[PDB]
Short mmCIF file of C-alpha atoms in Angstrom, two decimals:
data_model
loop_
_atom_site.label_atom_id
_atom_site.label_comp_id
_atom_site.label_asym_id
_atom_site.label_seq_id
_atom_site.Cartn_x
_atom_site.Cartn_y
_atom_site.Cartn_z
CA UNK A 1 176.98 167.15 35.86
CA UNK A 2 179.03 169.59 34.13
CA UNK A 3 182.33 170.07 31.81
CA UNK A 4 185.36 171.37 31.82
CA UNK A 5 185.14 173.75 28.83
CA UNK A 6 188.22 174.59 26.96
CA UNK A 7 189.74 178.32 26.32
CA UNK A 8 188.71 180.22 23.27
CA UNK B 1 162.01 164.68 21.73
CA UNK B 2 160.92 165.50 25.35
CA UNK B 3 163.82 166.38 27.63
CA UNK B 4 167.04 169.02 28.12
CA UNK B 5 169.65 169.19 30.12
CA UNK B 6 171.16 172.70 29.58
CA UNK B 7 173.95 174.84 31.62
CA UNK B 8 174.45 178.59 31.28
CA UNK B 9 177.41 180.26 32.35
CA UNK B 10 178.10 183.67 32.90
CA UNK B 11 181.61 185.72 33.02
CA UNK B 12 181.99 189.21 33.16
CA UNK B 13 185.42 191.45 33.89
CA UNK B 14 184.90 194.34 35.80
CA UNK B 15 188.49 195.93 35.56
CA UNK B 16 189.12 198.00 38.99
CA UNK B 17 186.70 195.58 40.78
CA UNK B 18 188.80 192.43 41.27
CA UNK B 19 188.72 189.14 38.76
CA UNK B 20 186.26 188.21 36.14
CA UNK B 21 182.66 187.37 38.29
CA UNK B 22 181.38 183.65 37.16
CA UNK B 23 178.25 182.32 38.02
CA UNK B 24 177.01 178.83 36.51
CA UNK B 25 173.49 177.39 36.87
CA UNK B 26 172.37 174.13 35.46
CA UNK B 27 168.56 173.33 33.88
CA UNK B 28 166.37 169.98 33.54
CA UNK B 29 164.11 171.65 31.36
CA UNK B 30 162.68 174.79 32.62
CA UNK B 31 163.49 173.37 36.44
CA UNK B 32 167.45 174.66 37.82
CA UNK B 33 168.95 172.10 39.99
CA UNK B 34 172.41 173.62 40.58
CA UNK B 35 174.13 176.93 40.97
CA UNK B 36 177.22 178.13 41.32
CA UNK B 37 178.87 181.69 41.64
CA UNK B 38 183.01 182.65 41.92
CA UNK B 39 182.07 185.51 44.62
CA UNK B 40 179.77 183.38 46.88
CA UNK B 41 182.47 183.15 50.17
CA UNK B 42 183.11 179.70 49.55
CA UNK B 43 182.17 178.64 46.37
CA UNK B 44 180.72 175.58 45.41
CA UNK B 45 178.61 173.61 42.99
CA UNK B 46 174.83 174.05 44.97
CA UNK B 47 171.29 172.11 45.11
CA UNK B 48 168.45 174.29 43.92
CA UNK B 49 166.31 171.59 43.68
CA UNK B 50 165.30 168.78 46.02
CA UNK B 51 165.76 165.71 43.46
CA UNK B 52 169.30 166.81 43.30
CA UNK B 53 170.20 166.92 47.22
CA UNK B 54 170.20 163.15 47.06
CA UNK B 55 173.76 163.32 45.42
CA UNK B 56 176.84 162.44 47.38
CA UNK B 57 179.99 164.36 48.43
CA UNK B 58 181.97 162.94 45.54
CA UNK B 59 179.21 164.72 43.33
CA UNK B 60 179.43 167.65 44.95
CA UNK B 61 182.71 168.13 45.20
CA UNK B 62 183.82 166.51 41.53
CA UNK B 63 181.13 169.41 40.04
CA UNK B 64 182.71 171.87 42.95
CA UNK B 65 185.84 171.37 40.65
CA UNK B 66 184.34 171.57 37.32
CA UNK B 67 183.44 174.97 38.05
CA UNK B 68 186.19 176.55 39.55
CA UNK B 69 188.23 175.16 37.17
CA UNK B 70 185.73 176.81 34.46
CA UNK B 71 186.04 180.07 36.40
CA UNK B 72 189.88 180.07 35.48
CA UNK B 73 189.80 179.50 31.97
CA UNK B 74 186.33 181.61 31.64
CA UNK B 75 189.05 184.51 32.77
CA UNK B 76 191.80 183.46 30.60
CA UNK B 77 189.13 183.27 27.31
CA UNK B 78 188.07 187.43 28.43
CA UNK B 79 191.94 188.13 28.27
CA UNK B 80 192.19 185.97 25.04
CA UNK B 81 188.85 187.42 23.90
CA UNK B 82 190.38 191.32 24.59
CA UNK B 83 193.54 190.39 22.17
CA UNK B 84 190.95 189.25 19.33
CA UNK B 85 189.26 192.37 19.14
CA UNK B 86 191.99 194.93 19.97
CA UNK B 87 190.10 196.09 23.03
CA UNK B 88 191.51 197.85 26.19
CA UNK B 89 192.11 196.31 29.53
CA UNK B 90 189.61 199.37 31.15
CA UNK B 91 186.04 197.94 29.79
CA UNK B 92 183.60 195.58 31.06
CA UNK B 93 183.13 192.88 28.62
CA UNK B 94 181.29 189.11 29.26
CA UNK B 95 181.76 185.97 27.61
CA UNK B 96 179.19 183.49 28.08
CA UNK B 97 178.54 179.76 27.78
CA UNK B 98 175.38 177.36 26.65
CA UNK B 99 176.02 173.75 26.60
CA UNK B 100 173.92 169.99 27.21
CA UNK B 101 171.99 167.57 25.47
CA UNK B 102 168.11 166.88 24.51
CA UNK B 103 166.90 163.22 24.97
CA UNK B 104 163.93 162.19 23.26
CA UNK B 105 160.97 160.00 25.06
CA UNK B 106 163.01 156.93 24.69
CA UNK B 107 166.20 158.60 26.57
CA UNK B 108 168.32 158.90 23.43
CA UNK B 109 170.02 161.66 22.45
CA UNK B 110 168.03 163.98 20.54
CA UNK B 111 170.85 166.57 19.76
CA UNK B 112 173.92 167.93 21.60
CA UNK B 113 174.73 171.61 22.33
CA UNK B 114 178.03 173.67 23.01
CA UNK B 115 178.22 177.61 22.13
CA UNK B 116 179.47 180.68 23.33
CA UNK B 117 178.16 184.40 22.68
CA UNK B 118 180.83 187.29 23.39
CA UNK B 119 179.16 190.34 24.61
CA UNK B 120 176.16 189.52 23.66
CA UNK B 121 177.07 188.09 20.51
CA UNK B 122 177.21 184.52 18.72
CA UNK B 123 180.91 184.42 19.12
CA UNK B 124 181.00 180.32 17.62
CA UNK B 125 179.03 177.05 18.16
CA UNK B 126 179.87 173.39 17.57
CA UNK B 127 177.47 172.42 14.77
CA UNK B 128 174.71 169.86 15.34
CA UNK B 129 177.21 166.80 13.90
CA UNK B 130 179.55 167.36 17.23
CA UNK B 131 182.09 167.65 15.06
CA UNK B 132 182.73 170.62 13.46
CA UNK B 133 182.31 174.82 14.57
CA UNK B 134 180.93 177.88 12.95
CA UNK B 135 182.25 181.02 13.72
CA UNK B 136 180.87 184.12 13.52
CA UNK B 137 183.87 186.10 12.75
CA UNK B 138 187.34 186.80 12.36
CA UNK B 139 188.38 186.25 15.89
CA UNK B 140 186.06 183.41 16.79
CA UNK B 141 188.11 181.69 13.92
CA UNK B 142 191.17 182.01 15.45
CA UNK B 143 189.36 179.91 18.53
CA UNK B 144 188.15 177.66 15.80
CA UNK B 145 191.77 176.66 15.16
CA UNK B 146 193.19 175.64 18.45
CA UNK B 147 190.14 173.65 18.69
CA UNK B 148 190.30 172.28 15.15
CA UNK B 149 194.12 171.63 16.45
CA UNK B 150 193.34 170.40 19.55
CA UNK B 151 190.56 168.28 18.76
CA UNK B 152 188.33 169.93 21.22
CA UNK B 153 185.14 168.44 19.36
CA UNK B 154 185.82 164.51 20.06
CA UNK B 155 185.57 165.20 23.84
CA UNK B 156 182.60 167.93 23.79
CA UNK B 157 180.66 164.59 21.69
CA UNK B 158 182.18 162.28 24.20
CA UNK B 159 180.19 164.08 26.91
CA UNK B 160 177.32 165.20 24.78
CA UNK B 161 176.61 161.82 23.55
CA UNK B 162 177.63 159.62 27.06
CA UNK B 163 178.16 161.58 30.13
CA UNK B 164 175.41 164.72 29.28
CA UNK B 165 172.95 162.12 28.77
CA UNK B 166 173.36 159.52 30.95
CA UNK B 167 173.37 162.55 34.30
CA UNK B 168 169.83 164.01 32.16
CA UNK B 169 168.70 160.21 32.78
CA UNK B 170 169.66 160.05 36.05
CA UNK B 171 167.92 163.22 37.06
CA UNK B 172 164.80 162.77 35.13
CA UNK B 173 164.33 159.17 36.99
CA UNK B 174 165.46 161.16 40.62
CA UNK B 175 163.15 164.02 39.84
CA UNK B 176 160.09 161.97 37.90
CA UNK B 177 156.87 163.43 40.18
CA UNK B 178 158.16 166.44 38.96
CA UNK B 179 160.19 166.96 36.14
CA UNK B 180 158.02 164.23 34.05
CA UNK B 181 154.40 166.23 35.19
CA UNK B 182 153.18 169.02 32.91
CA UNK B 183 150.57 170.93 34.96
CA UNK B 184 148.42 172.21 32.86
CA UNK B 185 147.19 175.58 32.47
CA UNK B 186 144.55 177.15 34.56
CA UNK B 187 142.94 179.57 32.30
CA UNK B 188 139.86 182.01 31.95
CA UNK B 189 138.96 185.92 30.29
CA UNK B 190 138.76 189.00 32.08
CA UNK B 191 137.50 191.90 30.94
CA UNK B 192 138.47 195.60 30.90
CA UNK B 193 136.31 198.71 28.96
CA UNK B 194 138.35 200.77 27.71
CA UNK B 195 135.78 203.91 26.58
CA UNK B 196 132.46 203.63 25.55
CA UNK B 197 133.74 202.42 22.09
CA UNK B 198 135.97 199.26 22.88
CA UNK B 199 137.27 196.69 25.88
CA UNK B 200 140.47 195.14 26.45
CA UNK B 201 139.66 191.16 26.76
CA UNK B 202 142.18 189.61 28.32
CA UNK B 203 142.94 185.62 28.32
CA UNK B 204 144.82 184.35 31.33
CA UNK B 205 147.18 181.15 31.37
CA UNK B 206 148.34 180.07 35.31
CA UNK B 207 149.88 177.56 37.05
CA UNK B 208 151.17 175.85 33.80
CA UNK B 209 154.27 173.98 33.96
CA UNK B 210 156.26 173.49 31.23
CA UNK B 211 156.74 177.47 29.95
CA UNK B 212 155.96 176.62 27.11
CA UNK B 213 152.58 177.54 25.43
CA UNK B 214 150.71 179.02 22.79
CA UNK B 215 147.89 181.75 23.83
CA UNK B 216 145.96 182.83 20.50
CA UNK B 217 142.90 185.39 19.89
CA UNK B 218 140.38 184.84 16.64
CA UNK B 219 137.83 187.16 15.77
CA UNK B 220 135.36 185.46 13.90
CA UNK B 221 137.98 182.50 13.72
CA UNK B 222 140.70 184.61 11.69
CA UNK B 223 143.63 184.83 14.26
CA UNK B 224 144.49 188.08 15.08
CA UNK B 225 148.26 187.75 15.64
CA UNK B 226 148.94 191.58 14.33
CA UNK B 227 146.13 193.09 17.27
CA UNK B 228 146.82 190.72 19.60
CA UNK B 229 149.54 192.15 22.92
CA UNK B 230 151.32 189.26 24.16
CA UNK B 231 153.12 189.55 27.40
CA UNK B 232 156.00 187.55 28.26
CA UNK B 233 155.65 184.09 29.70
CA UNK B 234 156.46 184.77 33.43
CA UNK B 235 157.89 182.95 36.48
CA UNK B 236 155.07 182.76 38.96
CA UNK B 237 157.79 181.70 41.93
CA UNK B 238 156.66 178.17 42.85
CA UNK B 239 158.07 176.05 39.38
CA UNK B 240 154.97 177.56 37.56
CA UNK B 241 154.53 180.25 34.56
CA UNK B 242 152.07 182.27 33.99
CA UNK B 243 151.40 184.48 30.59
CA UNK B 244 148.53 186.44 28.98
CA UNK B 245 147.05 187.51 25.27
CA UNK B 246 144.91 190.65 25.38
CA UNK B 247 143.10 192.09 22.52
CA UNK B 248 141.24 195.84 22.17
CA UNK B 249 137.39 194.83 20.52
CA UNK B 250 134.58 197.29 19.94
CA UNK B 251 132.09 197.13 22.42
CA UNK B 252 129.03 194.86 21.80
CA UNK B 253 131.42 192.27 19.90
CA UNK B 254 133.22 190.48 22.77
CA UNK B 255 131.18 187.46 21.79
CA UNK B 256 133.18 187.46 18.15
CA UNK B 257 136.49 186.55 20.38
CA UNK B 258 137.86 183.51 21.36
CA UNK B 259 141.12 182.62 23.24
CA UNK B 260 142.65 179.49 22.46
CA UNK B 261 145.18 178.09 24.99
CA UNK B 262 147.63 175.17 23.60
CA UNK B 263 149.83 173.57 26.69
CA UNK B 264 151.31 169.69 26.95
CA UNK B 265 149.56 169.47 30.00
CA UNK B 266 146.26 169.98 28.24
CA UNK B 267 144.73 166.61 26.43
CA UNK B 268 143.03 169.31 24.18
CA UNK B 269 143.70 172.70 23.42
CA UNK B 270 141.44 174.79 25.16
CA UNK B 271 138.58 177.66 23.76
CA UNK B 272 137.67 180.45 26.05
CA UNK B 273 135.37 183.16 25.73
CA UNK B 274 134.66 186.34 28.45
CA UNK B 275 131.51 184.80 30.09
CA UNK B 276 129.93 187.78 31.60
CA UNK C 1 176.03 195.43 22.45
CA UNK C 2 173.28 196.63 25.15
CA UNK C 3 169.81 195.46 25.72
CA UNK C 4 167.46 197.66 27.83
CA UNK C 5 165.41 195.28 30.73
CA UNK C 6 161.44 194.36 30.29
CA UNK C 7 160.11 194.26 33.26
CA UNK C 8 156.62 192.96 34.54
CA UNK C 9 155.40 193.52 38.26
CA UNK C 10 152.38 191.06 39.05
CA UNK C 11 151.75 188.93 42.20
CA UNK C 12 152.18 185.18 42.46
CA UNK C 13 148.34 184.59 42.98
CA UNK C 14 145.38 186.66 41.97
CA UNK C 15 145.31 189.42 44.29
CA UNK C 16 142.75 189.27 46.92
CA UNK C 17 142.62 192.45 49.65
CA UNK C 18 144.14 190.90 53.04
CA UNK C 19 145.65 187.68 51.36
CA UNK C 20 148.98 187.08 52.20
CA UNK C 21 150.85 186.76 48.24
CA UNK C 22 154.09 187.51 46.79
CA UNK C 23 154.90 190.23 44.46
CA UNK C 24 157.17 189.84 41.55
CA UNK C 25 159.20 191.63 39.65
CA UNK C 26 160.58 189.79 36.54
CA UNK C 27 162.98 191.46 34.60
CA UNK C 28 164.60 189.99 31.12
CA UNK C 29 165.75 190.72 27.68
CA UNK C 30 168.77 192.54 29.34
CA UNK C 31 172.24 192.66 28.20
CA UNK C 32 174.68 193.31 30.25
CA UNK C 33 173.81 191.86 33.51
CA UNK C 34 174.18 194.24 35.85
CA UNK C 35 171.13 195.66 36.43
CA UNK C 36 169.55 197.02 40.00
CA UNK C 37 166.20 196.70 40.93
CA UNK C 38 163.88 197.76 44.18
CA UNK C 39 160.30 196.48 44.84
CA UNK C 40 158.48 199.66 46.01
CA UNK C 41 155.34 199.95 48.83
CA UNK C 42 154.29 203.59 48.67
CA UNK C 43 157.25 204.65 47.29
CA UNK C 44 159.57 203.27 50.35
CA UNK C 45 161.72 200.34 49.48
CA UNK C 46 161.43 197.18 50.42
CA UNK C 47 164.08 195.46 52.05
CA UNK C 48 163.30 191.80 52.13
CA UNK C 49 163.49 190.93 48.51
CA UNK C 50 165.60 188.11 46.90
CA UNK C 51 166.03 187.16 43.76
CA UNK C 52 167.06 184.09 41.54
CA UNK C 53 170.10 183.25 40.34
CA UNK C 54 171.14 184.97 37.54
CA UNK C 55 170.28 182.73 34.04
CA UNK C 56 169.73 183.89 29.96
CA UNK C 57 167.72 182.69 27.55
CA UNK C 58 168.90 180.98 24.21
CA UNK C 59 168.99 184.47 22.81
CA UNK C 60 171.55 185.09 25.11
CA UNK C 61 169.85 188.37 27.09
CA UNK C 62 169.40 187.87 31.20
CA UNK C 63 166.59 186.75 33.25
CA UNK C 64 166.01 187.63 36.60
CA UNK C 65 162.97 187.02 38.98
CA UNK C 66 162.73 189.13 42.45
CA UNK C 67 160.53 188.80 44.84
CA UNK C 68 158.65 188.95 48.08
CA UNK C 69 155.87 188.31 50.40
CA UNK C 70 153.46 190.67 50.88
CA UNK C 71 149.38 191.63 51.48
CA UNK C 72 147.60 193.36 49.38
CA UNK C 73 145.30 196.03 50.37
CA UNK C 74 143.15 198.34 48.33
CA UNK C 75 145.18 201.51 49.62
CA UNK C 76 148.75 200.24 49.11
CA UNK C 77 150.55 200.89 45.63
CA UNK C 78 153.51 198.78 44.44
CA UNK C 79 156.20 199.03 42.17
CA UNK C 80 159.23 197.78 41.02
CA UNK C 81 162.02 200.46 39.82
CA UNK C 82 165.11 199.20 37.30
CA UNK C 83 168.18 200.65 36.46
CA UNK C 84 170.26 199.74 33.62
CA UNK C 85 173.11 201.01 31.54
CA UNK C 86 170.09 201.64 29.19
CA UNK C 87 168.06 203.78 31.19
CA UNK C 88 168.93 207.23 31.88
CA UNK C 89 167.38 207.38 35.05
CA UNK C 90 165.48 204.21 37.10
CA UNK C 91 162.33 202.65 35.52
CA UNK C 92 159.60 202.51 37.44
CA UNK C 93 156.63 199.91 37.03
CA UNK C 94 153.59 200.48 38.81
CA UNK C 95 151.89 197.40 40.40
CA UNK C 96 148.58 196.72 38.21
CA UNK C 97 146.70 193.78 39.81
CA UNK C 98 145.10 192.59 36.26
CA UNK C 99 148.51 192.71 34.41
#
């Protein structure tokens, strides 16, 4: 399962 | 250790061409079980493996999410990403992302993983403690910082250390006949004169499953790493790899050669020579 | 940056003369990933090819495998021809059944 990644 | 999960995701603007183009596609070692692409008509988190079909609709649709949602700030990172370097709206430019976990034998985790590279570039990585970043600039520090502020790091461990690992358990169990089997190698020399003065010998690896392997020439036991062309190691198509060493000897001293072939699959590294 | 593609053409099986097989074209070490590539039968292209889904390595340059079915016969040549934003004009690989 994947993430929810965050803005750089 | 024994086991990765691992998911690499891709976005690239193409200004003049519509919206930044994501495409996402998830690993169990060197097996992908999931795929996912912004310009597919309807996209959606897809099976590209069978062990993973078994999965319901609330999997499906929960990792559906994930990615679309990724798509969106994947796009809003490139415009971020733009500002940080002073670039202009008109280029191309691609941002992407490597993230998972490796479990050892016993299931634990073995290490967690979360970086980015920005055009090709380490752009910054959360260290191996899950807790703190290294950036490789000037701009990736300014990403540092709203994590650092945000506390980004707790929740990439949270996942790294309970969710990541507990799905790469799941799978591994789902997918044993497969993803637990190392097929080994199946090997052998061929042989190619060159001139009347020297022949290419070349040591074959096929079939092997995982990619990894080690394909070595000696001459009179010295290794002959320097003389020694090394191709690649290559998808055959069905799961498999293939890859091959091949070294130039003088004719008349093929015998002097040996190949050795070092694969998991293998209970001992093997020793080949061309048998004429 | 810009990497320019590798690219290996080789069948899935040894080659036999008159056994059905699939030839590959594997193309990595790229960067960016837009990159165009044609498996070639006597020059012609070939139009059922697919490919996978596009993936890097840890180094960060693209992967890509393409692919089809095909005999081969002691008269037919293959190749695969790649473009890049690091080629001047299309690569092409000639088909070399012991490579």
């Amino acid at each position: 399962g994947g993430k929810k990644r965050y803005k750089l | 250790g024994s086991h990765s999960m691992r998911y690499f995701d891709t976005a690239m603007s193409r200004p003049g061409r519509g919206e930044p183009r994501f495409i996402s596609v998830g690993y169990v070692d060197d097996t992908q079980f999931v795929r996912f692409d912004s310009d597919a008509a309807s996209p959606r988190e897809e099976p590209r493996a069978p062990w993973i079909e078994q999965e319901g609709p609330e999997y499906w649709d929960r990792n559906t999410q994930i990615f679309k949602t990724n798509t969106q700030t994947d796009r809003e990172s490139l415009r971020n990403l733009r500002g940080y370097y002073n670039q202009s709206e008109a280029g191309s430019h691609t941002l992407q992302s490597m993230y998972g976990c490796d479990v050892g034998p016993d299931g634990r985790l073995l290490r967690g993983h979360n970086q980015y590279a920005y055009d090709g570039k380490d752009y910054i990585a959360l260290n191996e403690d899950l807790r703190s970043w290294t950036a490789a600039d000037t701009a990736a520090q300014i990403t540092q910082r709203k994590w650092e502020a945000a506390r980004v790091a707790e929740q990439d461990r949270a996942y790294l250390e309970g969710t990541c690992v507990e799905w790469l358990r799941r799978y591994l169990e789902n997918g044993k006949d497969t993803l637990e089997r190392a097929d080994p190698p199946k090997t052998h020399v061929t042989h190619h004169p060159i001139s009347d003065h020297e022949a290419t010998l070349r040591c074959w690896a096929l079939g092997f499953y995982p990619a990894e392997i080690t394909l070595t020439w000696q001459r009179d036991g010295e290794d002959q790493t320097q003389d020694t062309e090394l191709v690649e190691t290559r998808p055959a198509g069905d799961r498999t790899f293939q890859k091959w060493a091949a070294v130039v000897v003088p004719s008349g001293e093929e015998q002097r050669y040996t190949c050795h072939v070092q694969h998991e699959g293998l209970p001992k590294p093997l020793t080949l020579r061309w048998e004429p | 940056i810009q990497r320019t593609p590798k690219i290996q053409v080789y069948s899935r099986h040894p080659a036999e003369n008159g056994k059905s097989n699939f030839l590959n074209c594997y193309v990595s070490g790229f960067h960016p990933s837009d990159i165009e590539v044609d498996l070639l039968k006597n020059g012609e292209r070939i139009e059922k090819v697919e490919h996978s889904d596009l993936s890097f390595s840890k180094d960060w340059s693209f992967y890509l495998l393409y692919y089809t079915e095909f005999t081969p016969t002691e008269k037919d040549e293959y190749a695969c021809r790649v473009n890049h934003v690091t080629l001047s004009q299309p690569k092409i690989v000639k088909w070399d059944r012991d490579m």
